[PDB]
Amino acid sequence: ATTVQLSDQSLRQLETLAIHTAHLIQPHGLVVVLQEPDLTISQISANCTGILGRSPEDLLGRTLGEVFDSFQIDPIQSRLTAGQISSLNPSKLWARVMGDDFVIFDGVFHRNSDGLLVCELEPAYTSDNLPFLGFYHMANAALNRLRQQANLRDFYDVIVEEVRRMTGFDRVMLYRFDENNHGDVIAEDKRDDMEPYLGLHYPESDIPQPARRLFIHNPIRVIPDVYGVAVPLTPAVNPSTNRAVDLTESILRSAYHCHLTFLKNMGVGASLTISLIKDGHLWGLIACHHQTPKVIPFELRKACEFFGRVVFSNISAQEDTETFDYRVQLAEHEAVLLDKMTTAADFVEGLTNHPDRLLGLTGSQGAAICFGEKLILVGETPDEKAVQYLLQWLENREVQDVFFTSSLSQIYPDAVNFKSVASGLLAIPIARHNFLLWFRPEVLQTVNWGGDPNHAYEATQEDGKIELHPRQSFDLWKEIVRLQSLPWQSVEIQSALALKKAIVNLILRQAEEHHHH
Amino acid sequence: ATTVQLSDQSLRQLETLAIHTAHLIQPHGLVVVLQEPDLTISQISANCTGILGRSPEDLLGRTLGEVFDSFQIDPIQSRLTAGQISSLNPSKLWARVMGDDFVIFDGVFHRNSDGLLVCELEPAYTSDNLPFLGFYHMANAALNRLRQQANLRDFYDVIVEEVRRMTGFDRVMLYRFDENNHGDVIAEDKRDDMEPYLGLHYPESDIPQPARRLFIHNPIRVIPDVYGVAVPLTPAVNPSTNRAVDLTESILRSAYHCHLTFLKNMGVGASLTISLIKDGHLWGLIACHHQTPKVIPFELRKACEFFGRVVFSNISAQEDTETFDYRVQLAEHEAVLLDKMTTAADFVEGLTNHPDRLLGLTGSQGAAICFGEKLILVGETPDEKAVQYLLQWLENREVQDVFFTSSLSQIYPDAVNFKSVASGLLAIPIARHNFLLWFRPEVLQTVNWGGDPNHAYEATQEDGKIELHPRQSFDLWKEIVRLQSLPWQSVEIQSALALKKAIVNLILRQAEEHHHH
Ligand SMILES: *[C@H](C)[C@H]1/C(=C/c2[nH]c(/C=C3N=C(/C=C4\NC(=O)C(CC)=C4C)C(C)=C\3CCC(=O)O)c(CCC(=O)O)c2C)NC(=O)[C@@H]1C
Ligand SMILES: *[C@H](C)[C@H]1/C(=C/c2[nH]c(/C=C3N=C(/C=C4\NC(=O)C(CC)=C4C)C(C)=C\3CCC(=O)O)c(CCC(=O)O)c2C)NC(=O)[C@@H]1C
Ligand code: NA
Ligand code: NA
Ligand code: NA
Ligand code: NA
């Protein structure tokens, strides 16, 4: 009711939101919390009335066998084991309703963080319309081709194309988290009449810390009907804990209202989201949208997850391989320089005679060799005077092992005047008083924000309670990044460091030879 | 002095051995522990006398700058940062000894678990004989070929072949830890006149828990001279903690004596060991042996580690891809069965008409369909009577979601009589009273132990102290494993489970149709 300016309180409310203990359940399925070994129903979603014709009053304190028939759930005397649970997934359960009616579910069990058994019953449309056993062969062929020859981009595209082929989703995206946990849509496959989100960048707050954390424990989220009105667990608290049941790993947990409102604003009728995890860190999501409601049965979700994770394993290997390959390319430059340096009369002469190697060593476009009295400028550099003032600035600030920046202007303001040749600077001190410098030009870089980063959500405060809402503007923002070079890669800096080392060895060997001899 | 029978006390002594706080240092290099910001020497290895001509009495309490000249170690006012440290690695330091002498080191710094700065000085033979910049190109080409077409075995071989090419080691092995942390030598490249360890299996105690733990924190261990007599840190305790310095991440930490004795027994003069880590778990080691002493400088070790880890990243992807590919092959079998099952008059007829699909579904060689009154035997099975007794045994033991074993004889002893067709059994209950069974024959499997598993080391007790020694027998043992089938793979069990599910759906759909109609 009261429009609240975006605050520190509204941001730390967002990052601490207890979404995992929400008690609201998506209305197409039943959640039953079960006390072992009898499988006594201790909580049940209130949609049991409409689905089963039996109220929570009729069901709480009954055993699961009194409510459902099944083939595979026997009465056993101790708590269900992890292996037992995973083999129950999914299992057919059915109830006889009104009189002349089967209602058939596929049930999926898990034990939550506090040891409570949770059973989730999704309607079984036996096997009605979404095969993937055959589509697995097309997905496998696609992966096989990538493994023959591919860029990283080809892997991204295969994930989105094959998940969309298998599922029939109107839109499938690959969403990658960056260093600040902003998101980038790095691949997309969608209907031709839908607008592209490919290349769009989103604030960290769109998928906040509790949502990201959830995806580390729970690989898959599905919402088959965004407009489904959520129903409560009854009671809202678990009888044995007296507290809300932890639904981190729940299929049928209804999403936090603000995310639902976000999807509704976007015209999304159904979604499927699968996480890609590396070394316990959330790397990204396969994010699928449909414009209308859409059921994705458990086996199909698991097939998409299996394929996506096998492709992702191949993406890690591809990233590591490209890094190695680039290091090897740079090692050639290093080796040629060391060969010519130690062969020349004077080692600076060796360097100057091989400028494409010297520049190639760090992926750069200009360089300066400053040794003793001489200053040699190679490739595209600032003019001699500017380099001298820059050298002087580097000398006056306590000599690190290396200085590098991809936007020199914002720590050295006079660099605005040579932004077209040296927005980027890599400076290595050699024997204290000397320097090798490498230079890179401005490259304009555009961040295509999918919403306003400075107005990333909406907050209201009623009765002391802060409420948070998705942003109401659909405008796009492009941030045009200027005075910035391409970034320095770790292997380029290491290659530069390796040249420094080789020069230092030369100087020491020459000092040792003019002592001994 | 007193021969001690191998015990629980000697085994838990082995698993709790504090190797990381050993104060003995390999004699070719110096260790200095340094107090910041002055870099005051608080401990030093006692070989400083011979290497520098200066005793610990002369050095303790001096700053590093009083002892060594360098280009890159400046006096700075706060503790060295992680980025500063890693750029110092390696840095040239040199001392002037006797009078007319340089002694030159490459120094490598780290901050240990307790915040102490440790500097390790290995002699610099500038760049004297072991290039790898060029060999990186051959290693890269080898990796490139694997990525075009390869089995897992090809990846193992590339690691050992290229590390050996780059290093010149007499023997290079890939050592993989199994589920019990026994080791298997799964690849090897060695001089033709040396005996092969390829295919040998070793007890967990050969590389005990403290050694494995060390490799999670410290990727590389090197011992350039196994016969080098280790020298103490002086003092043996750090002045600021009053306790032994944690040398987990130390290059020059001398190995525990029993491992040295092991290497000496094996004729090893030098070693290099690089760990391969996945998801915080130690997967395996690249283990290199030379028959004589051998220096492997820091940069070469890091090059081997980088290559080995890039190949290992590709090995994870290959393992995931082969698993996926096998699941897809099995999914074809599943799909054909479901198609023929739902098309036949009766679904058992569908199964029986496609026996290569039914067997192929689980990688098995025989099967039994037991539904209601009929029992159909497919492929190589036990005789009808034996299958009936087995069915009866399965019925009497509370029905899991699945029973599988790769050695039926050791829980069902009468299975010894049909070991050639059903050493392995996969049994799935369907609708409670029915079963699908799959059968597999005995396949003899040999474990080539590299030493006696029942006498895996030697223990003595003198004066209350238990001492442990490497085993003294060089005999090999082969364990010939009998009455055992090939193991059931997870994807084969899942495929069988998927058939069960499909049959259950059929039965429910037929029960629903004969109710409604
Ligand atoms: C409202 C308070 C704020 C908010 C909160 C919020 N977000 C989520 C979860 C997700 N948000 C997304 C984001 C996107 N999906 C997309 O397709 C795109 C376009 C490329 C975006 C930006 C996604 C994928 C999730 C994961 C959940 C899912 O089912 O996919 C949570 C999670 C809530 C839950 O209960 O599970 C919350 C609380 N989001 C906003 O818009 C506001 C800033
Ligand atoms: C003596 C008490 C027991 C023992 C202890 C022990 N072992 C190690 C470390 C290693 N052992 C090996 C084992 C092998 N290397 C090989 O090439 C082969 C043949 C294939 C084997 C079996 C290896 C590779 C290591 C790692 C250390 C390394 O430098 O390579 C430790 C570690 C000690 C340390 O201080 O670092 C200890 C205490 N080993 C025995 O033989 C006895 C059972
Ligand atoms: Na019942
Ligand atoms: Na962009
Ligand atoms: Na000095
Ligand atoms: Na063997």
Q: Which ligand is nearest to the CA of A481?
A: 4
The DSSP string of B72-86 is S----SSPPPHHHHH
Distance B441 CA to ligand 6 centre (A): 19
Ligand 1 pocket, residue A287 CB under 6 Å: yes
SS3 A284: strand
CA distance B449 to B4: 23
Resolution (A): 2.0
Distance A152 CA to ligand 4 centre (A): 17
Q: Is B258 annotated as a binding residue?
A: yes
Tokens, residue B150:
């390869």
Smallest Cβ distance to A398: which of B74, B126, B509? B74
Look up residue B151 and give its DSSP letter: -
Q: Which residues contact B45 (CB under 8 A, 6 or more apart)?
A: B25, B29, B30, B31, B32, B231, B232, B233, B234, B252
Give the separation between CA B15 and CA B203, rounded to whole angstroms. 13
Cis peptide before B219 (omega within 30 of 0): no
CB crowding A299-327: b at 16 or more within 10 Å, else e? bbbbbbbbbbbbbbbbbbbbebbebbbbb
Instruction: Answer whether B313 sits within 8 Å of A317, measured CB to CB.
Output: yes
With an 8 Å Cβ cutoff, are B133 and A331 in contact?
A: yes
Instruction: Give the C-alpha separation, A265 to A201, whole Å.
Output: 18
Distance CA B189, CA B171 (A): 6
User: What are the b/e assignments for B238-252, b being 16+ CB within 10 Å?
Assistant: beeeeebbbbbbbbb
Give the gyration radius of chain B's Cα atoms.
30
> Are A3 and A461 in contact, with CB atoms under 8 Å apart?
no
Q: Give the pairing of strands A69-70 and A91-97.
A: antiparallel
| Local structure of residue B408 (DSSP, 8 states) | G
The CA distance from B45 to the nearest CA of chain A, in Å, is: 25
By most ligand atoms within 8 Å of CB, the mutation choice from B262, B266, B275 for ligand 2 is B262
Find where tokens 């083999």 sit. A87
Q: Terminal CA-to-CA distance of chain B, rounded, Å?
A: 88
**For chain A, the helix, strand and coil percentages under 3-state DSSP, each to the nearest 5:** 40, 25, 35
Contact B479, A67 (CB under 8 A): no
Separation between Cα atoms, residue B422 and residue B4, nearest integer Å: 44
Cα–Cα separations (whole angstroms), residue B430 to A98, B426, B434: 28, 13, 5
Task: For residue A447, give the ligand nearest its CA.
Answer: 4
The three state secondary structure string of A355-372 is HHHHHHCCCCCEEEEEEC
CB A136 within 8 A of CB A167: no
Q: Is the CB of A457 under 6 A from ligand 1?
A: yes
Please state whether beta strands A220-223 and A3-4 pair in parallel, antiparallel, or not at all (unpaired): unpaired
Nearest ligand to the CA atom of A21: 1
Query: Which residue among A126, A133, A429 places its CB closest to the CB of B335?
Result: A133
CA distance B292 to B272: 13
Q: Is A435 in the pocket of ligand 1 (CB under 6 A)?
A: no
- B126·A508 Cβ contact <8 A: yes
Experimental method: X-ray
In three-state secondary structure terms, A329 is: helix
- List domains and CATH numbers for chain A: 1-17+130-228+257-323+443-483 (3.30.450.40), 18-129+229-256 (3.30.450.20), 324-442+484-517 (3.30.450.270)
Rg (CA), chain A: 30
Please write down the long-range contacts of A258-266, taking CB distance under 8 Å and 24 or more positions apart.
Answer: A258/A457, A258/A468, A258/A469, A258/A470, A259/A211, A259/A470, A260/A223, A260/A226, A261/A469, A261/A470, A262/A206, A262/A470, A263/A223, A263/A226, A263/A289, A264/A226, A264/A227, A265/A470, A265/A472, A265/A474
Q: For residue A160, report the phi and psi dihedrals to the nearest 5 degrees.
A: -65, -40
Q: Please give the backbone phi and psi of residue A4, each rounded to the nearest 5 degrees, phi first.
A: -110, 125
CA of A238 to the centre of ligand 6 (A): 53
Helix axes A135-148, B298-343, angle to 10 degrees: 160
Measured in whole angstroms, the distance separating CA A115 from the mean position of its chain's CA atoms is: 30
CA B249/CA B120 separation, integer angstroms: 11
Cα B466 to Cα B446: distance, rounded to the nearest angstrom: 34
Which of B12, B160, B207 best tests ligand 2's pocket when mutated (most atoms within 8 Å of CB)? B207
User: Which of B133, B334, B399 has the CB atom closest to A335's CB atom?
Assistant: B133
Q: From the list A280, A321, A508, which residue is nearest B310 (CB)?
A: A321
| Separation CA B144–CA A317 (nearest Å) | 12
Which token pair is A432?
């204290």
Residue A81, both tokens: 């084991």
On whether the CB atoms of residues A336 and A344 are closer than 8 A, the answer is no
Task: Show residues of chain A in contact with B334, CB under 8 Å.
Answer: 133
Q: Whose CA is nearest to atom 29 of ligand 1?
A: A221
Each as own residue / partner, the long-range contacts of residues A457-462 (CB below 8 Å, 24 or more positions apart, any chain) are A457/A6, A457/A10, A457/A14, A457/A205, A457/A258, A459/A4, A459/A5, A459/A6, A459/A7, A459/A10, A460/A1, A460/A2, A460/A3, A460/A4, A461/A2, A461/A4, A462/A1, A462/A2
Burial zone of A85 (CB within 10 Å; 0-12 exposed, 13-18 middle, 19+ buried)? middle
What is the 8-class DSSP label of residue A163?
H
Residues 6+ apart with CB under 8 A from B137: A328, A331, A332
Taking the centre of ligand 5 as the mean of its atom positions, its distance from the CA of residue B68, in whole angstroms, is 5
